[PDB]
Design goal:
- The PDB classes it as unknown function.
- Keywords: Rad51D, Homologous Recombination, unknown function.
- This protein has one domain.
- The protein is 43% helix and 0% strand.
- It is built from 4 helices and no strands.
- The N and C termini lie far apart (36 Å).
Length: 83
């Protein structure tokens, strides 16, 4: 299980949650592909705190190193019923 939101850690705010919801951002799973490095600098956050959590998540999944499967989840969402 993997999900991100406001309150998970002393840093993120409900305000940022609205920004992600606007882009229909996915759970922490998608974050792995997101531009956390760029976003972190834009907002001025500490990427060190983010990477730390990731290492712990993967650490529990498996002691040894291993690359996960990032299946393409990009929906066009065009030519849809506007009315």
């Amino acid at each position: 299980m993997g999900v991100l939101r406001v309150g998970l850690c002393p840093g993120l705010t409900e305000e940022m949650i609205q920004l992600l919801r606007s882009h229909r951002i996915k759970t922490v799973v998608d974050l792995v592909s997101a531009d956390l490095e760029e976003v972190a600098q834009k907002c001025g956050l500490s990427y060190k705190a983010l990477v730390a959590l990731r290492r712990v998540l993967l650490a529990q999944f498996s002691a040894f190193p291993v690359n996960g499967a990032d299946l393409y989840e990009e929906l066009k969402t065009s030519t849809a019923i506007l009315s």
